Amino acid sequence: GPLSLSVDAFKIPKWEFPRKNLVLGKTLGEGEFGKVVKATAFHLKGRAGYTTVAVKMLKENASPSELRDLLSEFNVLKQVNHPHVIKLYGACSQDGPLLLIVEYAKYGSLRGFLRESLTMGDLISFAWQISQGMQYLAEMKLVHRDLAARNILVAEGRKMKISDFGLSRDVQGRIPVKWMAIESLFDHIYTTQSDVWSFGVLLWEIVTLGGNPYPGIPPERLFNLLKTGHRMERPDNCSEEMYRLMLQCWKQEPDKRPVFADISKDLEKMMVKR
Amino acid sequence: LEDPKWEFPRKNLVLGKTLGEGEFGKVVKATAFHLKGRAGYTTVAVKMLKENASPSELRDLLSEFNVLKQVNHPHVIKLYGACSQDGPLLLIVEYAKYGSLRGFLRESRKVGPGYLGDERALTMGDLISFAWQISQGMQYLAEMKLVHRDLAARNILVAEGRKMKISDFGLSRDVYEEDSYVKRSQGRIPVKWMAIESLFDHIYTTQSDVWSFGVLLWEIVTLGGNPYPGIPPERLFNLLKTGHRMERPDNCSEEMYRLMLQCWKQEPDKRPVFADISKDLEKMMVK
Ligand SMILES: Cc1cc(NC(=O)c2cn(C3(C)CC3)c3ncnc(N)c23)n[nH]1
Ligand SMILES: Cc1cc(NC(=O)c2cn(C3(C)CC3)c3ncnc(N)c23)n[nH]1
């Protein structure tokens, strides 16, 4: 089938990293996304000595869907280069488990980083960096699908990195209900404008310092609440202008939502006006 | 839609500790007041959506509910009811005091009297009985034109009297129309339990459940061993296609291993059906 074709083609120069030059270290995180470990990589992409990296691999008892997702991430990440998209350095396809080698983010996920915590200027900068990355991916005709604070990484210099491309598509449902657009929930449609909806939820997560969206509402009740026009209220320590941006990301009609260039512009205007 | 045969008052269900959490959802221990004619409280288990559930997880829980309303067997987990209205979907089922079969067998390695070659003492006779009970459950599910798809030791429960209960119907599908279920997209069943034709061709039948049953037999006789130990799942495509199968484990007769190998035949029509698996396990017990 499609996966067996992909695996064999993958197994068989620019991307293949010698397994002997990778020393896997401590586990950074585990879950349905897979397993990510810290590692050191000798002579990685022409760099002297050891480069500290993160390595993504399959969890125990991986399904075809999880293997397909990891191969899809490699395919996507080969083609993208942006300061706020996680950088692929290579893969190990010839020695034991499939490994993807990416840049290391020392502060972990944005959700984790915010929860352990920053000024409102920093939070607006974090939103802007992510919007810049998303504007780039939108221009490359990639729909990410899984935008959330857990899938943004915080690297050296508090630099945002979009990660977790396993659900991404070129332009059943495994995106959590609470980050999904209304058209995604009811009609199974995913576009850059549904990424904008998810970005709105991510913006709410940023201002709440890694809060849980729609707290107390189960996802099985959220379907009807979104159709009737209910949205999350303005949270504590959030300006009227920032909340206005969120609400526009959650417009029922996708054409009424901002594009990422509009989101980036809003955040640029905010930061100069401070 | 609310079915008064199954709908249970929310105020009558009290939830306790998490028994298990993962891809399947979340299962908690609970108690239910005035459940299905029983006066007072009854200890039960409740399956619910985990935190940050997706539409696929909700559809799977709804599908389990629909399946378990229609299927009844001494070796299938018993549905008692559901709380479906004005809140999270909670499925109320029979509590299995010993947990998963995988967990129960792994405990038998360290908990006396252990495996010997009362209910913590295990013999090969007991292991054959467990396999037989599961095969009886699967034979009935096959008559019901249901393919389970996710048969594994982690998804068999060990209840009072060490009675086997098939659980985790979230991936199960009806095959009444063509005797097969086919999915265009990639499945969510762990690779190491999948039939060759499921892995390559996305075809699921009762004969692909038979393959999975063979892997379950291997898990039973190894006291909860991990299939294809140390082999990455991406290597299974080549491994299976070239005719490789798991070797005869320690603690496995020739007859039992022949049954596993029969369950892993490349051609699905050469594999035994569940009625014959049941017969094979009966002949092993009596001798
Ligand atoms: C190919 C790919 C890799 C990836 N994800 C990460 O690289 C990372 C995930 N984490 C978490 C928060 C789980 C531990 C990381 N932590 C520190 N550095 C990191 N590069 C990561 N997505 N797609
Ligand atoms: C509708 C449904 C329920 C279910 N699963 C379980 O009810 C159970 C799962 N576990 C595990 C091993 C995870 C903790 C149980 N343990 C003790 N009793 C139990 N009834 C269970 N599948 N489908």
Side-chain angles (χ1 to χ4, degrees):
Chain A
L3 186 54
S4 68
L5 294 173
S6 296
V7 170
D8 182 52
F10 200 86
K11 291 183 168 281
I12 307 163
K14 194 185 185 79
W15 297 112
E16 193 66 31
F17 187 66
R19 185 67 187 79
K20 70 180 188 182
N21 293 335
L22 192 64
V23 180
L24 300 181
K26 71 184 185 82
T27 301
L28 296 164
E30 309 186 60
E32 287 221 78
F33 67 86
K35 178 173 172 188
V36 178
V37 305
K38 195 168 172 185
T40 58
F42 183 69
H43 283 188
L44 185 65
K45 273 205 171 284
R47 294 171 48 75
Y50 289 98
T51 303
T52 302
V53 293
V55 182
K56 187 162 181 178
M57 64 198 75
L58 298 177
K59 64 140 185 279
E60 290 175 47
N61 307 149
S63 63
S65 170
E66 291 167 85
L67 180 53
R68 186 231 75 94
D69 288 358
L70 196 64
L71 294 169
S72 193
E73 293 205 84
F74 179 77
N75 180 240
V76 167
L77 294 170
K78 276 199 295 188
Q79 303 174 52
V80 294
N81 187 257
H82 195 266
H84 304 299
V85 176
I86 199 78
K87 184 177 195 310
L88 181 69
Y89 285 110
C92 299
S93 72
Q94 307 295 297
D95 297 86
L98 171 51
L99 307 179
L100 302 190
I101 304 162
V102 301
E103 79 187 288
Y104 173 61
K106 69 181 282 185
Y107 303 101
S109 73
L110 181 58
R111 184 167 182 283
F113 181 70
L114 294 166
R115 279 182 158 281
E116 90 197 331
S117 308
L118 297 167
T119 59
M120 186 54 62
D122 296 325
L123 299 186
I124 295 157
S125 181
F126 300 161
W128 175 80
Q129 291 171 53
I130 298 155
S131 190
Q132 288 291 276
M134 284 312 307
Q135 196 180 336
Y136 169 83
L137 294 165
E139 287 168 21
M140 301 288 280
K141 307 293 287 188
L142 189 130
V143 186
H144 187 280
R145 297 183 54 236
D146 208 19
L147 269 73
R150 69 182 182 277
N151 297 329
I152 305 301
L153 303 164
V154 183
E156 194 176 309
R158 300 172 164 178
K159 296 287 183 71
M160 301 299 96
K161 310 286 173 155
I162 299 156
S163 69
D164 189 9
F165 288 77
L167 301 177
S168 67
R169 296 290 187 282
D170 69 319
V171 62
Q172 58 160 245
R174 277 193 286 121
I175 306 141
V177 165
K178 296 195 181 185
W179 284 259
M180 284 173 64
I182 187 159
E183 73 281 12
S184 304
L185 291 164
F186 283 85
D187 302 326
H188 294 44
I189 295 159
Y190 298 94
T191 65
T192 300
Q193 299 317 104
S194 61
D195 282 346
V196 166
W197 182 294
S198 302
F199 186 87
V201 182
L202 174 53
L203 203 58
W204 187 94
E205 291 182 281
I206 290 163
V207 303
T208 59
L209 302 169
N212 298 321
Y214 308 93
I217 300 160
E220 48 271 76
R221 287 208 295 105
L222 186 55
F223 286 91
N224 290 326
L225 295 169
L226 292 172
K227 201 190 175 184
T228 55
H230 299 83
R231 302 292 183 272
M232 285 188 279
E233 72 196 328
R234 184 174 159 186
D236 301 341
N237 315 134
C238 178
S239 67
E240 198 179 310
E241 294 183 312
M242 185 56 70
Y243 185 60
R244 178 155 52 256
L245 181 57
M246 290 183 205
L247 280 178
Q248 205 200 339
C249 296
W250 309 323
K251 289 281 177 190
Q252 193 185 250
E253 171 54 48
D255 294 348
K256 299 202 170 183
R257 298 167 200 166
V259 302
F260 282 108
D262 304 332
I263 293 162
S264 297
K265 185 64 73 174
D266 247 35
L267 301 161
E268 290 157 4
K269 293 278 185 180
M270 282 178 210
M271 274 175 292
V272 75
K273 288 203 84 180
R274 296 180 81 74
Chain B
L1 264 67
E2 51 264 44
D3 192 336
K5 187 166 171 59
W6 303 103
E7 194 65 23
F8 187 72
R10 289 198 182 260
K11 74 184 195 182
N12 291 355
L13 186 65
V14 178
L15 307 179
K17 70 182 180 181
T18 300
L19 296 169
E21 222 163 23
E23 39 178 43
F24 68 90
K26 179 179 177 195
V27 177
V28 305
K29 199 167 176 179
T31 192
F33 190 71
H34 206 47
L35 192 65
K36 289 284 189 172
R38 290 170 275 273
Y41 291 97
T42 300
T43 301
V44 296
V46 172
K47 189 164 183 180
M48 68 193 74
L49 297 185
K50 42 167 265 179
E51 289 177 48
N52 301 337
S54 59
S56 70
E57 292 164 74
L58 179 55
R59 289 295 164 210
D60 289 351
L61 194 61
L62 288 163
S63 185
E64 289 208 77
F65 186 29
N66 189 60
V67 169
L68 294 170
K69 291 174 184 182
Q70 301 301 320
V71 303
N72 289 300
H73 193 269
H75 302 300
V76 173
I77 194 67
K78 184 158 45 159
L79 178 71
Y80 293 136
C83 301
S84 78
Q85 305 299 306
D86 203 59
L89 181 56
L90 306 177
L91 299 193
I92 308 166
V93 301
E94 108 191 80
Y95 173 63
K97 67 184 269 200
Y98 298 105
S100 70
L101 180 60
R102 180 177 192 281
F104 179 72
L105 296 174
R106 288 187 81 89
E107 283 158 6
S108 85
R109 302 175 184 197
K110 58 171 175 283
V111 176
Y115 181 69
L116 301 174
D118 190 86
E119 303 204 338
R120 297 288 180 174
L122 284 177
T123 63
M124 180 51 78
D126 300 324
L127 299 187
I128 298 162
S129 171
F130 298 161
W132 180 81
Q133 292 173 48
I134 297 153
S135 186
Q136 292 289 272
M138 289 307 297
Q139 184 186 319
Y140 167 81
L141 295 170
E143 292 300 310
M144 298 298 292
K145 301 297 193 185
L146 197 72
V147 299
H148 188 278
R149 302 175 57 231
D150 203 11
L151 195 61
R154 65 179 173 274
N155 295 332
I156 306 301
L157 306 169
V158 181
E160 186 141 46
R162 304 195 307 196
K163 297 298 181 196
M164 302 297 97
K165 307 289 176 162
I166 296 157
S167 71
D168 189 8
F169 287 81
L171 301 180
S172 76
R173 300 292 173 265
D174 202 320
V175 301
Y176 190 85
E177 301 300 331
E178 301 299 317
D179 295 306
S180 74
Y181 170 77
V182 170
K183 188 178 198 266
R184 190 182 286 273
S185 58
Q186 298 302 325
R188 297 191 275 109
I189 295 81
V191 167
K192 291 175 176 197
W193 284 258
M194 289 177 67
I196 191 168
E197 73 282 3
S198 307
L199 187 65
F200 281 94
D201 297 349
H202 300 214
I203 297 171
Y204 297 89
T205 64
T206 297
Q207 300 311 101
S208 62
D209 281 350
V210 168
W211 180 292
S212 300
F213 187 85
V215 182
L216 173 61
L217 286 178
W218 187 98
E219 294 185 275
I220 287 166
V221 303
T222 59
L223 306 177
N226 296 329
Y228 306 94
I231 295 164
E234 65 268 27
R235 303 226 295 101
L236 270 283
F237 293 97
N238 187 63
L239 189 154
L240 299 174
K241 184 181 79 185
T242 58
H244 295 81
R245 301 294 184 266
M246 287 192 275
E247 68 187 51
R248 182 175 166 198
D250 297 306
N251 194 48
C252 186
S253 69
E254 194 179 305
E255 204 170 20
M256 185 60 81
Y257 187 59
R258 284 191 300 102
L259 177 57
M260 294 179 195
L261 290 182
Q262 285 183 79
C263 295
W264 308 323
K265 288 283 186 180
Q266 193 174 258
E267 171 49 55
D269 298 38
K270 301 291 176 69
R271 300 171 198 155
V273 298
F274 282 110
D276 291 331
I277 293 165
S278 293
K279 180 266 302 316
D280 295 335
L281 294 164
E282 291 154 20
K283 294 291 183 172
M284 287 179 213
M285 189 74 77
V286 67
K287 299 170 194 292

